Specification:
This protein has 276 residues and is an alpha+beta fold. Helices cover 37% and strands 22% of the residues. It contains 8 helices and 12 strands. Strand 2 and strand 3 form a beta hairpin. The structure holds the ligand C[C@@H](Oc1cc(-c2cnn(C)c2)cc2nscc12)[C@H]1CNC(=O)O1. It comes from Homo sapiens.
């Protein structure tokens, strides 16, 4: 898969930031393609670390190897005043911010969105990729009923003869989204992404509230070790809280993979639609 370079002269950027990803500040832009001016999201590597350039280009490369309706598509790379990763713009933005601003969104609509995420994740697992940053801030809404997975900055392609990535450097990690085996032994698998998916589901049903609010990483570790978990969000269906708890199975061997998770979501979604 060859890198696609874009022409800086055909790209216009707005100064208002959409937010930041693992390896860059993201701004809304416009890419002049033939006669159509296409709205885009541009991740700009400021780098206020020489390895950071390699991390952004690896993220672009991971995106180019993926092709799924629930995974953000990249348009190309632009090497100009900074290294830039140009991707398709998800107009409604991150799920957590969207739900904080739209408390009227139904439980049925949330189920549809997290089910779409589980489908993209099942595809990722089958392809031998680990996401390593699965959280509501990285689920982007194209429309109110169409979510896509984003930010592949920490993602890794596993070799066909391995089932986990061993981190060599303990960097700035989103510990509240990480499974115990990640925190304790630096081992990241698709099952570790399932744990993160459970936290994502809690964030979605809590309308973008922060998980484990005010707690230190050590307090979260202590809580999980003794078999305790975040509470059931107000109005969250029992089946969805039970699925969160299954994603939060402590022992990685006994935790379900995304095929089991997507099946439970698909079944519950069809029960919700068909009950009324
Ligand atoms: C900054 C944010 O990325 C994006 C954010 C928004 C966005 C934000 N607000 N609004 C309305 C829209 C749209 C996007 N389309 S493609 C990437 C983004 C994080 C999440 N993933 C990532 O790589 O960085």
């Amino acid at each position: 898969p060859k890198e696609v370079y874009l022409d800086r002269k055909l790209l216009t950027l707005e100064d208002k930031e959409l937010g930041s990803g693992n390896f860059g500040t993201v701004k809304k832009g416009y890419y002049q393609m033939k006669k159509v001016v296409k709205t885009v999201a541009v991740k700009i590597l400021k780098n206020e670390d020489p390895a950071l350039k390699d991390e952004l280009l690896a993220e672009a490369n991971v995106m180019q190897q993926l092709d799924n309706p629930y995974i953000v598509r990249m348009i190309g790379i632009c090497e100009a005043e900074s290294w830039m990763l140009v991707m398709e713009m998800a107009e409604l933005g991150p799920l957590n911010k969207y739900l904080q601003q739209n408390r009227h969104v139904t439980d049925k609509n949330i189920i549809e969105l997290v089910h779409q995420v589980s489908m993209g994740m099942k595809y990722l697992e089958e392809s031998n990729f680990v996401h390593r940053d699965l959280a509501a801030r990285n689920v982007l809404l194209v429309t109110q009923h169409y979510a896509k997975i984003s930010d592949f900055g920490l993602s890794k392609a596993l070799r066909a003869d391995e089932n986990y990535y061993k981190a060599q450097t303990h960097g700035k990690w989103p510990v509240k989204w990480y499974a115990p085996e990640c925190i304790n032994y630096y081992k990241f698998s698709s099952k570790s992404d399932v744990w993160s998916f459970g936290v994502l589901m809690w964030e979605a049903f809590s309308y973008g509230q922060k998980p484990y609010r005010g707690m230190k990483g050590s307090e979260v570790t202590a809580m999980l070790e003794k078999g305790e978990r975040m509470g059931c969000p107000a109005g969250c269906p029992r089946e969805m809280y039970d699925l969160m708890n299954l994603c939060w199975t402590y022992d990685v061997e006994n935790r379900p993979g995304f095929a089991a998770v997507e099946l439970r979501l698909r079944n519950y979604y069809y029960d919700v639609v068909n009950e009324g």
